[PDB]
Amino acid sequence: SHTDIKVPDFSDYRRPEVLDSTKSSKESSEARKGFSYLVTATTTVGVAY
Amino acid sequence: VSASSRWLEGIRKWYYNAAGFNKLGLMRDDTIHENDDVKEAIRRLPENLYNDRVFRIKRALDLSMRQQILPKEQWTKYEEDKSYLEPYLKEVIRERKEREEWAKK
Amino acid sequence: ATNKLCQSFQTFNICYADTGLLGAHFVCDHMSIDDMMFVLQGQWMRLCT
Amino acid sequence: AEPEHDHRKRMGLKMLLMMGLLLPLVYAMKRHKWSVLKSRKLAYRPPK
Amino acid sequence: LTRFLGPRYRQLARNWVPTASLWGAVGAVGLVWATDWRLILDWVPYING
Amino acid sequence: LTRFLGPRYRQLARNWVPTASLWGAVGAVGLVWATDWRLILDWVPYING
Amino acid sequence: NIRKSHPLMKIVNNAFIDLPAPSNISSWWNFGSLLGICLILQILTGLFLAMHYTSDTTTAFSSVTHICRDVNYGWIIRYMHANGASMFFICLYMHVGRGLYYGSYTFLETWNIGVILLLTVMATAFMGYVLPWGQMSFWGATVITNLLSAIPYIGTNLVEWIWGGFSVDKATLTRFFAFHFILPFIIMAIAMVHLLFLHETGSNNPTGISSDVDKIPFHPYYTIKDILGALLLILALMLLVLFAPDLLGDPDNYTPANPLNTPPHIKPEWYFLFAYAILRSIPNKLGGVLALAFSILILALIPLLHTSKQRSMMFRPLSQCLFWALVADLLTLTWIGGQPVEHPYITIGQLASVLYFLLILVLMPTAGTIENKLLKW
Amino acid sequence: GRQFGHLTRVRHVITYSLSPFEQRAFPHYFSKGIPNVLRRTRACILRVAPPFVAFYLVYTWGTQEFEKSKRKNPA
Amino acid sequence: VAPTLTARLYSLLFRRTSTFALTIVVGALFFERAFDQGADAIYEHINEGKLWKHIKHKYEN
Ligand SMILES: CCCCCCCCCCCCCCCC(=O)OC[C@H](COP(=O)(O)OCCN)OC(=O)CCCCCCCCCCCCCCC
Ligand SMILES: CCCCCCCCCCCCCCCCCC(=O)OC[C@H](COP(=O)(O)OCCN)OC(=O)CCCCCCCCCCCCC
Ligand SMILES: CCCCCCCCCCCCCC(=O)OC[C@H](COP(=O)(O)OCC[N+](C)(C)C)OC(=O)CCCCCCCCCCCCC
Ligand SMILES: CCCCCCCCCCCCCC(=O)OC[C@H](COP(=O)(O)OCC[N+](C)(C)C)OC(=O)CCCCCCCCCCCCC
Ligand code: HEM
Ligand code: HEM
Ligand SMILES: C[C@@]1(c2ccc(Oc3ccccc3)nc2)OC(=O)N(Nc2ccccc2)C1=O
Ligand SMILES: CCCCCC(=O)OC[C@H](COP(=O)([O-])OCCN)OC(=O)CCCCC
Ligand SMILES: CCCCCC(=O)OC[C@H](COP(=O)([O-])OCCN)OC(=O)CCCCC
Ligand SMILES: [Cl-]
């Protein structure tokens, strides 16, 4: 009965790269982290200045 | 007894929808302030009613975080609001008043 | 063992076609989940570096 | 009465530009972390 | 807060009224003494100096 | 405190010398940048103003 | 795990990192940390202003001008300190108003410790305004200190004892500087006991319903939310400092103090105007001074006037309207406080003063009881 | 100070979460956010607004009256 | 440029915290020079006649 549990669909939340079930997340693993960590680094630069 | 009673109940149903806790799926007893009488009554709740109370409050806090409400279909209807906690709380209060009356003599 | 952080844990590397699950699983008292997670991840990072 | 007038206006311009950068970036950091919670889904499955 | 109105509570107050009366004398004399209150101390016999 | 002299401890130091070298560049550049150290910054190309 | 076991970091961890906090606290819960940011801002700017300030009546005015003219970036530090004090009162009133709306006063020790923090910050800022020794500085010190003369049979002694003379003079300014220096550090210590009692229960939330079923760690959720709010506090402060540094001050304060002449249009700082309006609506001397004190000390009574069986006003429409009638009424007293004592402002200020105490004492507790009956409990 | 693992009792509640590097930080910011602001404004406008409208009318009348009273009238 | 730009920035500079900090301190250095340069050029363009450094040529000595 715990096998009746399925994770709901996040398609209206996911980023564009990771919406394809038949495509690896490793492909966009590199870009997605850089986009978010770029925002952090810029913030520190502004605080630094 | 429809004429005068239904106008009073009509104003209560107005206030119930105006209060708006039904818009988060909550019931009236979910919103009561937890004092010592209320913690004991909640403690006395059976398993199912306790677990239902927990999830409704959890669902409402999740909504309050997102500044959202449930769809109108899922609002708590005024006529279907169950005062599941009131009978337990009434007994807890009755017991405390008995202690207080014994503490006077 | 010394701090009684869990009743058991196991590491695993579950393989499939072009994908898999690499990690660990453990079982513990409710006041020990955080310490087990901490020590577990610390060892992953320690081996990485 | 206000010899700092010109210098304060130059600083005010720099303050507005940096805030115009930092406010949306810091806002973005807040939403990034909070997105774990804002898209979380709940389900209640009690035994019957 | 009506629960404190009863025969026991009025027996309890009667037991503590001699003590509270005396702690009022301590504070009254202590206030007169610490401030050198001339309005009261002119009447005490030996203090007059 | 002789216990830290061994083959494992010199393998451990070798793993962390690239990281500590880089944290020295962070602090060195951070010190030069925060103090406007003219002795070093006159040599940087675009900074000269 | 080392964040938890070190004797010193365990305090930091259990207060800012692993502290369980409600998942749904709104932006109105940001003012707690902003009050601490304000307190730290005022201590730093204030400390750097004391390095170039003299409490001599003959040079106190000139030492402040020396800061804003000759000290390297002394003016920006100066106007951060002045405007930071106003931002302090913006955060105080929102922090208080948050707690009134959402029923946070039911934490009696935290609330009552809060009322103490409000009064000490008020005393601190009053003495701070006396230091530059302008016209409003001197006559601000004259009016407020004379309030103690209303105390029967000891008032003049308390006033002259505080003044160090028969009037506000050099002895009064030098000691107000010593008090203004030290009182912020006592406030910081009392703010820790404020937080100590709070952590016993954790935070309230907008619903007024217990949130133990849904808690999130303070880090990273409310560290970044508090960081964002601080950047907005700096924005609000720097807009004043860098584009309108005299908008909240009075021009007469740029003339040195003169004990012989009082300006005709006395106007306190904006954060005292509502209570100044309450006092003058009572022509009796002692009566108006007691009404001033009770307009603030009434906060200590709010926990005793709670009648609703629900904690927060989120689900209490009748209380919401009365709550906003109190904000608009306080906005009216602030307006009346900034106008001269003449017709029709005298009568408006009297009606608003009655409405202020009428709302807190009578109307709002009765609304909470009507709401209970409407829900049939 | 309370701590996780000692807060309260919960049973039969499942939570699904997604990593923050897997989803948008501003999903439908305007396409969904603007409708929600209008919903919340409507729900509270009648509680908050009439008091401050009442202040605005009393403010303007008191200022107008004070201005006219200071102007003299022919004897 | 077949690999994504943000993807190459991550592998080279952001993966390690050490190089993630070095890029920030080096970024604040070059950001400070360009930001002050552009900010001052804007404040001066709005006020082209008014400033002293726009009138220092009259007073040669
Ligand atoms: C011992 C030190 C104690 C410090 C305590 C400070 C307390 C915090 C006060 C916050 C002040 C906000 C920034 C003032 C900017 C200013 O005024 O800087 C004026 C300068 C121009 O200056 P310039 O034109 O001379 O050219 C300079 C010569 N090259 O550009 C700015 O606007 C930069 C500010 C950007 C906008 C504000 C962003 C806020 C980020 C918060 C970081 C706070 C750091 C905390 C430090 C403790
Ligand atoms: C003391 C001297 C003061 C002198 C200065 C007076 C000037 C006052 C100027 C007016 C300030 C107005 C501030 C903005 C108020 C916005 C109110 C609002 O956004 O709507 C009401 C809001 C509804 O939110 P709920 O939590 O009920 O439910 C949300 C479900 N989506 O509910 C809320 O968000 C209410 C939260 C509490 C608001 C705090 C305002 C308090 C104002 C000062 C009070 C002073 C008390 C001494
Ligand atoms: C408006 C102004 C109001 C002021 C009015 C004046 C009030 C005078 C104080 C009256 C209260 C005295 C009560 C009291 O003594 O009890 C406290 C302890 C216990 O005394 P003890 O004899 O040990 O046992 C009492 C038993 N009894 C009553 C049955 C006899 O007794 C003591 O320990 C007190 C003596 C110790 C003194 C040292 C402590 C003071 C601080 C140290 C200062 C010197 C070093 C810097
Ligand atoms: C002699 C002078 C020496 C000074 C030289 C200058 C040094 C500059 C800082 C360099 C250190 C940067 C390291 C760093 O960013 O890590 C701390 C966090 C985590 O970043 P995050 O992107 O979340 O995860 C890092 C993962 N990684 C490394 C694999 C990409 O990143 C952050 O959170 C930092 C950005 C947050 C800024 C807000 C905090 C500052 C206080 C708030 C001030 C504004 C409100 C008043
Ligand atoms: C220097 C002045 C003050 C500082 C630094 C301060 C700081 C804080 C902080 C950090 C919190 C927890 C976070 C938050 O709720 O935002 C808090 C909570 C609280 N404060 Fe204060 N506070 C001050 C004054 C006051 C005053 C004057 C009152 C009331 C008269 C008050 C009443 C409360 C209450 C009731 C809470 C609990 C709020 C909740 O849990 O929802 N505080 N304060
Ligand atoms: C809660 C903390 C504080 C508040 C709310 C506050 C508020 C104020 C205010 C309103 C003024 C009048 C400014 C003016 O009229 O120009 C002032 C002046 C002053 N304050 Fe503070 N202050 C605080 C803490 C401190 C501290 C900790 C110090 C020193 C260590 C300090 C030192 C001064 C000095 C020297 C002045 C006179 C210079 C001037 O008028 O700008 N203050 N303060
Ligand atoms: C800054 C200020 C101040 C500070 C703090 C302060 O506390 C309170 C704030 C709110 C309620 C209660 C107290 N009340 C005034 O000190 C000062 O002299 N005036 N102006 C002035 C001029 C003439 C008469 C009275 C005051 C102020 O407005
Ligand atoms: C609360 C702080 C009280 C301090 C007041 C004060 O300065 O006290 C002075 C008077 C002096 O006694 P008096 O006979 O000169 O009388 C002179 C009258 N001005 O002593 C008293 O009257 C003390 C009164 C204590 C009441 C609480
Ligand atoms: C520990 C506190 C150090 C503060 C010293 C200081 O005031 O720094 C000024 C100099 C200025 O650079 P310079 O090229 O003019 O050189 C002028 C030489 N007087 O910058 C430096 O040299 C920074 C040196 C940092 C070493 C720790
Ligand atoms: Cl001045």
Side-chain angles (χ1 to χ4, degrees), chain G residues 4 12 21 71 115 118 129 132 139 153 158 176 185 207 225 257 271 275 278 296 298-299 309 331:
Chain G
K4 311 173 189 173
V12 175
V71 168
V115 172
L118 179 58
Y129 205 67
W139 298 116
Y153 180 79
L158 293 169
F176 276 30
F185 304 109
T207 74
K225 179 160 162 161
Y271 49 78
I278 290 168
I296 305 302
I298 192 170
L299 298 168
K309 286 177 69 269
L331 174 55

PDB file of all heavy atoms in Angstrom, chain G residues 4 12 21 71 115 118 129 132 139 153 158 176 185 207 225 257 271 275 278 296 298-299 309 331:
ATOM      1  N   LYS G   4      27.586  22.466  18.405  1.00  0.00           N
ATOM      2  CA  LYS G   4      26.706  22.121  19.517  1.00  0.00           C
ATOM      3  C   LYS G   4      27.413  21.901  20.851  1.00  0.00           C
ATOM      4  O   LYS G   4      26.762  22.052  21.892  1.00  0.00           O
ATOM      5  CB  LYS G   4      25.930  20.833  19.192  1.00  0.00           C
ATOM      6  CG  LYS G   4      25.259  20.794  17.824  1.00  0.00           C
ATOM      7  CD  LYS G   4      24.674  19.430  17.541  1.00  0.00           C
ATOM      8  CE  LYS G   4      24.212  19.320  16.095  1.00  0.00           C
ATOM      9  NZ  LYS G   4      23.775  17.942  15.726  1.00  0.00           N
ATOM     10  N   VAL G  12      25.247  30.360  20.562  1.00  0.00           N
ATOM     11  CA  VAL G  12      25.003  30.903  19.226  1.00  0.00           C
ATOM     12  C   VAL G  12      24.202  29.928  18.374  1.00  0.00           C
ATOM     13  O   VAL G  12      23.348  30.340  17.581  1.00  0.00           O
ATOM     14  CB  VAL G  12      26.332  31.279  18.546  1.00  0.00           C
ATOM     15  CG1 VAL G  12      26.083  31.720  17.104  1.00  0.00           C
ATOM     16  CG2 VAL G  12      27.039  32.369  19.331  1.00  0.00           C
ATOM     17  N   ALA G  21      12.016  27.582  14.447  1.00  0.00           N
ATOM     18  CA  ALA G  21      11.233  28.786  14.222  1.00  0.00           C
ATOM     19  C   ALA G  21      10.022  28.439  13.367  1.00  0.00           C
ATOM     20  O   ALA G  21      10.080  27.497  12.570  1.00  0.00           O
ATOM     21  CB  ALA G  21      12.055  29.873  13.522  1.00  0.00           C
ATOM     22  N   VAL G  71      35.803  67.019  10.374  1.00  0.00           N
ATOM     23  CA  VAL G  71      36.122  65.603  10.553  1.00  0.00           C
ATOM     24  C   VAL G  71      35.866  64.845   9.258  1.00  0.00           C
ATOM     25  O   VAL G  71      34.792  64.962   8.652  1.00  0.00           O
ATOM     26  CB  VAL G  71      35.300  65.008  11.707  1.00  0.00           C
ATOM     27  CG1 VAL G  71      35.402  63.483  11.712  1.00  0.00           C
ATOM     28  CG2 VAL G  71      35.761  65.579  13.043  1.00  0.00           C
ATOM     29  N   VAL G 115       8.458  46.259  27.298  1.00  0.00           N
ATOM     30  CA  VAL G 115       8.041  47.595  27.730  1.00  0.00           C
ATOM     31  C   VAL G 115       9.195  48.323  28.391  1.00  0.00           C
ATOM     32  O   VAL G 115       9.367  49.534  28.210  1.00  0.00           O
ATOM     33  CB  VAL G 115       6.833  47.506  28.682  1.00  0.00           C
ATOM     34  CG1 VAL G 115       6.523  48.864  29.268  1.00  0.00           C
ATOM     35  CG2 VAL G 115       5.606  46.961  27.954  1.00  0.00           C
ATOM     36  N   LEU G 118      11.381  49.644  25.640  1.00  0.00           N
ATOM     37  CA  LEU G 118      10.826  50.827  24.994  1.00  0.00           C
ATOM     38  C   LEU G 118      11.129  52.077  25.808  1.00  0.00           C
ATOM     39  O   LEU G 118      11.547  53.099  25.256  1.00  0.00           O
ATOM     40  CB  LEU G 118       9.311  50.679  24.816  1.00  0.00           C
ATOM     41  CG  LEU G 118       8.539  51.833  24.162  1.00  0.00           C
ATOM     42  CD1 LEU G 118       9.107  52.099  22.779  1.00  0.00           C
ATOM     43  CD2 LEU G 118       7.055  51.566  24.095  1.00  0.00           C
ATOM     44  N   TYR G 129      19.017  63.933  22.067  1.00  0.00           N
ATOM     45  CA  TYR G 129      18.568  65.169  21.432  1.00  0.00           C
ATOM     46  C   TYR G 129      18.974  66.433  22.193  1.00  0.00           C
ATOM     47  O   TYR G 129      19.001  67.520  21.599  1.00  0.00           O
ATOM     48  CB  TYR G 129      17.046  65.154  21.281  1.00  0.00           C
ATOM     49  CG  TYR G 129      16.527  66.039  20.161  1.00  0.00           C
ATOM     50  CD1 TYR G 129      16.788  65.744  18.827  1.00  0.00           C
ATOM     51  CD2 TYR G 129      15.794  67.194  20.449  1.00  0.00           C
ATOM     52  CE1 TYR G 129      16.323  66.566  17.812  1.00  0.00           C
ATOM     53  CE2 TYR G 129      15.322  68.010  19.446  1.00  0.00           C
ATOM     54  CZ  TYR G 129      15.590  67.697  18.127  1.00  0.00           C
ATOM     55  OH  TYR G 129      15.115  68.510  17.121  1.00  0.00           O
ATOM     56  N   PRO G 132      23.336  68.226  21.226  1.00  0.00           N
ATOM     57  CA  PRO G 132      23.820  69.280  20.311  1.00  0.00           C
ATOM     58  C   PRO G 132      23.535  70.707  20.790  1.00  0.00           C
ATOM     59  O   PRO G 132      24.107  71.660  20.240  1.00  0.00           O
ATOM     60  CB  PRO G 132      23.094  68.968  18.992  1.00  0.00           C
ATOM     61  CG  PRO G 132      21.925  68.141  19.372  1.00  0.00           C
ATOM     62  CD  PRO G 132      22.349  67.349  20.563  1.00  0.00           C
ATOM     63  N   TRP G 139      14.974  73.614  25.042  1.00  0.00           N
ATOM     64  CA  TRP G 139      13.575  73.697  25.444  1.00  0.00           C
ATOM     65  C   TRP G 139      12.889  72.343  25.419  1.00  0.00           C
ATOM     66  O   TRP G 139      11.829  72.187  26.037  1.00  0.00           O
ATOM     67  CB  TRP G 139      12.846  74.704  24.556  1.00  0.00           C
ATOM     68  CG  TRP G 139      13.438  76.082  24.701  1.00  0.00           C
ATOM     69  CD1 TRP G 139      14.070  76.806  23.740  1.00  0.00           C
ATOM     70  CD2 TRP G 139      13.456  76.887  25.888  1.00  0.00           C
ATOM     71  NE1 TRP G 139      14.489  78.008  24.250  1.00  0.00           N
ATOM     72  CE2 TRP G 139      14.121  78.084  25.568  1.00  0.00           C
ATOM     73  CE3 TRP G 139      12.976  76.710  27.190  1.00  0.00           C
ATOM     74  CZ2 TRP G 139      14.315  79.103  26.500  1.00  0.00           C
ATOM     75  CZ3 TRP G 139      13.169  77.714  28.111  1.00  0.00           C
ATOM     76  CH2 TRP G 139      13.833  78.898  27.763  1.00  0.00           C
ATOM     77  N   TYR G 153       4.657  67.078  46.095  1.00  0.00           N
ATOM     78  CA  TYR G 153       5.386  67.159  47.359  1.00  0.00           C
ATOM     79  C   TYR G 153       6.872  66.818  47.237  1.00  0.00           C
ATOM     80  O   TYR G 153       7.642  67.117  48.156  1.00  0.00           O
ATOM     81  CB  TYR G 153       4.715  66.249  48.405  1.00  0.00           C
ATOM     82  CG  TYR G 153       5.389  66.260  49.760  1.00  0.00           C
ATOM     83  CD1 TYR G 153       5.169  67.309  50.650  1.00  0.00           C
ATOM     84  CD2 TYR G 153       6.249  65.238  50.149  1.00  0.00           C
ATOM     85  CE1 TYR G 153       5.781  67.343  51.888  1.00  0.00           C
ATOM     86  CE2 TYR G 153       6.869  65.261  51.393  1.00  0.00           C
ATOM     87  CZ  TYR G 153       6.630  66.321  52.257  1.00  0.00           C
ATOM     88  OH  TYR G 153       7.233  66.369  53.494  1.00  0.00           O
ATOM     89  N   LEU G 158      12.970  66.594  42.843  1.00  0.00           N
ATOM     90  CA  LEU G 158      13.446  65.659  41.827  1.00  0.00           C
ATOM     91  C   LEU G 158      13.931  66.400  40.587  1.00  0.00           C
ATOM     92  O   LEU G 158      14.937  66.020  39.977  1.00  0.00           O
ATOM     93  CB  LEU G 158      12.350  64.653  41.457  1.00  0.00           C
ATOM     94  CG  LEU G 158      11.918  63.633  42.523  1.00  0.00           C
ATOM     95  CD1 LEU G 158      10.655  62.898  42.094  1.00  0.00           C
ATOM     96  CD2 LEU G 158      13.031  62.635  42.820  1.00  0.00           C
ATOM     97  N   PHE G 176      23.670  64.300  31.174  1.00  0.00           N
ATOM     98  CA  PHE G 176      22.873  63.693  30.117  1.00  0.00           C
ATOM     99  C   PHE G 176      23.768  63.004  29.097  1.00  0.00           C
ATOM    100  O   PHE G 176      23.387  61.971  28.530  1.00  0.00           O
ATOM    101  CB  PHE G 176      22.004  64.755  29.441  1.00  0.00           C
ATOM    102  CG  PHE G 176      20.701  65.029  30.147  1.00  0.00           C
ATOM    103  CD1 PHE G 176      20.579  64.883  31.522  1.00  0.00           C
ATOM    104  CD2 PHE G 176      19.607  65.486  29.429  1.00  0.00           C
ATOM    105  CE1 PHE G 176      19.376  65.144  32.158  1.00  0.00           C
ATOM    106  CE2 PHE G 176      18.405  65.758  30.061  1.00  0.00           C
ATOM    107  CZ  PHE G 176      18.289  65.589  31.427  1.00  0.00           C
ATOM    108  N   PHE G 185      24.163  50.466  26.402  1.00  0.00           N
ATOM    109  CA  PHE G 185      24.751  49.178  26.767  1.00  0.00           C
ATOM    110  C   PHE G 185      23.854  48.401  27.726  1.00  0.00           C
ATOM    111  O   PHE G 185      23.750  47.173  27.620  1.00  0.00           O
ATOM    112  CB  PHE G 185      26.147  49.401  27.357  1.00  0.00           C
ATOM    113  CG  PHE G 185      27.055  50.154  26.433  1.00  0.00           C
ATOM    114  CD1 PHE G 185      27.422  51.455  26.713  1.00  0.00           C
ATOM    115  CD2 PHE G 185      27.509  49.574  25.262  1.00  0.00           C
ATOM    116  CE1 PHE G 185      28.235  52.159  25.849  1.00  0.00           C
ATOM    117  CE2 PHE G 185      28.321  50.276  24.390  1.00  0.00           C
ATOM    118  CZ  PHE G 185      28.675  51.569  24.680  1.00  0.00           C
ATOM    119  N   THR G 207      -0.884  33.134  12.379  1.00  0.00           N
ATOM    120  CA  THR G 207      -2.168  32.503  12.662  1.00  0.00           C
ATOM    121  C   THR G 207      -2.507  32.469  14.150  1.00  0.00           C
ATOM    122  O   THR G 207      -3.668  32.225  14.502  1.00  0.00           O
ATOM    123  CB  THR G 207      -2.197  31.076  12.103  1.00  0.00           C
ATOM    124  OG1 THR G 207      -1.393  30.212  12.918  1.00  0.00           O
ATOM    125  CG2 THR G 207      -1.684  31.054  10.665  1.00  0.00           C
ATOM    126  N   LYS G 225      16.503  35.764   5.240  1.00  0.00           N
ATOM    127  CA  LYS G 225      15.382  36.692   5.295  1.00  0.00           C
ATOM    128  C   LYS G 225      15.724  37.902   6.159  1.00  0.00           C
ATOM    129  O   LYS G 225      15.325  39.031   5.847  1.00  0.00           O
ATOM    130  CB  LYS G 225      14.143  35.968   5.811  1.00  0.00           C
ATOM    131  CG  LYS G 225      12.911  36.825   5.951  1.00  0.00           C
ATOM    132  CD  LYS G 225      11.675  35.947   5.993  1.00  0.00           C
ATOM    133  CE  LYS G 225      10.483  36.686   6.555  1.00  0.00           C
ATOM    134  NZ  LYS G 225       9.221  35.990   6.167  1.00  0.00           N
ATOM    135  N   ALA G 257      21.584  77.227  21.764  1.00  0.00           N
ATOM    136  CA  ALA G 257      20.611  77.354  22.836  1.00  0.00           C
ATOM    137  C   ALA G 257      20.666  78.739  23.450  1.00  0.00           C
ATOM    138  O   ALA G 257      21.737  79.330  23.590  1.00  0.00           O
ATOM    139  CB  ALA G 257      20.865  76.296  23.910  1.00  0.00           C
ATOM    140  N   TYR G 271       8.417  61.087  16.531  1.00  0.00           N
ATOM    141  CA  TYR G 271       8.140  59.912  17.352  1.00  0.00           C
ATOM    142  C   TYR G 271       7.672  60.227  18.765  1.00  0.00           C
ATOM    143  O   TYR G 271       7.466  59.289  19.542  1.00  0.00           O
ATOM    144  CB  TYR G 271       9.373  59.002  17.390  1.00  0.00           C
ATOM    145  CG  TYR G 271      10.697  59.659  17.709  1.00  0.00           C
ATOM    146  CD1 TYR G 271      11.038  59.994  19.013  1.00  0.00           C
ATOM    147  CD2 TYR G 271      11.602  59.952  16.696  1.00  0.00           C
ATOM    148  CE1 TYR G 271      12.264  60.577  19.302  1.00  0.00           C
ATOM    149  CE2 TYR G 271      12.820  60.539  16.972  1.00  0.00           C
ATOM    150  CZ  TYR G 271      13.151  60.851  18.277  1.00  0.00           C
ATOM    151  OH  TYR G 271      14.368  61.443  18.551  1.00  0.00           O
ATOM    152  N   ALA G 275       2.163  61.350  21.908  1.00  0.00           N
ATOM    153  CA  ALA G 275       2.082  61.456  23.361  1.00  0.00           C
ATOM    154  C   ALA G 275       2.124  62.903  23.832  1.00  0.00           C
ATOM    155  O   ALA G 275       1.503  63.244  24.846  1.00  0.00           O
ATOM    156  CB  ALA G 275       3.224  60.661  23.997  1.00  0.00           C
ATOM    157  N   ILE G 278      -1.396  63.968  23.686  1.00  0.00           N
ATOM    158  CA  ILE G 278      -2.225  63.451  24.776  1.00  0.00           C
ATOM    159  C   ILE G 278      -2.101  64.360  25.993  1.00  0.00           C
ATOM    160  O   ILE G 278      -3.099  64.691  26.647  1.00  0.00           O
ATOM    161  CB  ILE G 278      -1.863  61.988  25.107  1.00  0.00           C
ATOM    162  CG1 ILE G 278      -2.304  61.067  23.964  1.00  0.00           C
ATOM    163  CG2 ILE G 278      -2.513  61.552  26.432  1.00  0.00           C
ATOM    164  CD1 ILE G 278      -1.754  59.643  24.039  1.00  0.00           C
ATOM    165  N   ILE G 296       1.710  55.278  27.613  1.00  0.00           N
ATOM    166  CA  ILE G 296       2.749  54.303  27.313  1.00  0.00           C
ATOM    167  C   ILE G 296       2.678  53.114  28.259  1.00  0.00           C
ATOM    168  O   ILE G 296       2.757  51.965  27.822  1.00  0.00           O
ATOM    169  CB  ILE G 296       4.144  54.958  27.372  1.00  0.00           C
ATOM    170  CG1 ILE G 296       4.221  56.180  26.440  1.00  0.00           C
ATOM    171  CG2 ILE G 296       5.213  53.910  27.057  1.00  0.00           C
ATOM    172  CD1 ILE G 296       3.922  55.896  24.973  1.00  0.00           C
ATOM    173  N   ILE G 298       0.268  51.819  29.605  1.00  0.00           N
ATOM    174  CA  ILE G 298      -0.915  51.004  29.367  1.00  0.00           C
ATOM    175  C   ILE G 298      -0.560  49.708  28.649  1.00  0.00           C
ATOM    176  O   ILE G 298      -1.305  48.725  28.745  1.00  0.00           O
ATOM    177  CB  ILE G 298      -1.924  51.823  28.540  1.00  0.00           C
ATOM    178  CG1 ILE G 298      -3.295  51.168  28.487  1.00  0.00           C
ATOM    179  CG2 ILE G 298      -1.402  52.012  27.106  1.00  0.00           C
ATOM    180  CD1 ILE G 298      -4.339  52.093  27.886  1.00  0.00           C
ATOM    181  N   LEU G 299       0.555  49.689  27.908  1.00  0.00           N
ATOM    182  CA  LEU G 299       1.021  48.460  27.269  1.00  0.00           C
ATOM    183  C   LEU G 299       1.196  47.324  28.265  1.00  0.00           C
ATOM    184  O   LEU G 299       0.948  46.164  27.925  1.00  0.00           O
ATOM    185  CB  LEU G 299       2.333  48.704  26.533  1.00  0.00           C
ATOM    186  CG  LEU G 299       2.304  49.720  25.399  1.00  0.00           C
ATOM    187  CD1 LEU G 299       3.736  50.058  24.995  1.00  0.00           C
ATOM    188  CD2 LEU G 299       1.515  49.179  24.214  1.00  0.00           C
ATOM    189  N   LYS G 309     -10.956  34.207  22.851  1.00  0.00           N
ATOM    190  CA  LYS G 309     -10.448  32.851  22.981  1.00  0.00           C
ATOM    191  C   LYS G 309      -9.466  32.478  21.870  1.00  0.00           C
ATOM    192  O   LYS G 309      -8.931  31.364  21.897  1.00  0.00           O
ATOM    193  CB  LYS G 309     -11.617  31.854  23.056  1.00  0.00           C
ATOM    194  CG  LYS G 309     -12.294  31.953  24.430  1.00  0.00           C
ATOM    195  CD  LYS G 309     -13.515  31.093  24.640  1.00  0.00           C
ATOM    196  CE  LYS G 309     -13.138  29.589  24.706  1.00  0.00           C
ATOM    197  NZ  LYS G 309     -13.164  28.841  23.430  1.00  0.00           N
ATOM    198  N   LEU G 331      -2.195  58.079  14.475  1.00  0.00           N
ATOM    199  CA  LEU G 331      -1.767  58.981  13.413  1.00  0.00           C
ATOM    200  C   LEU G 331      -2.406  60.357  13.564  1.00  0.00           C
ATOM    201  O   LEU G 331      -1.796  61.367  13.194  1.00  0.00           O
ATOM    202  CB  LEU G 331      -2.098  58.355  12.059  1.00  0.00           C
ATOM    203  CG  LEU G 331      -1.856  59.193  10.810  1.00  0.00           C
ATOM    204  CD1 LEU G 331      -0.425  59.683  10.759  1.00  0.00           C
ATOM    205  CD2 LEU G 331      -2.194  58.371   9.583  1.00  0.00           C
TER     206      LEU G 331
END
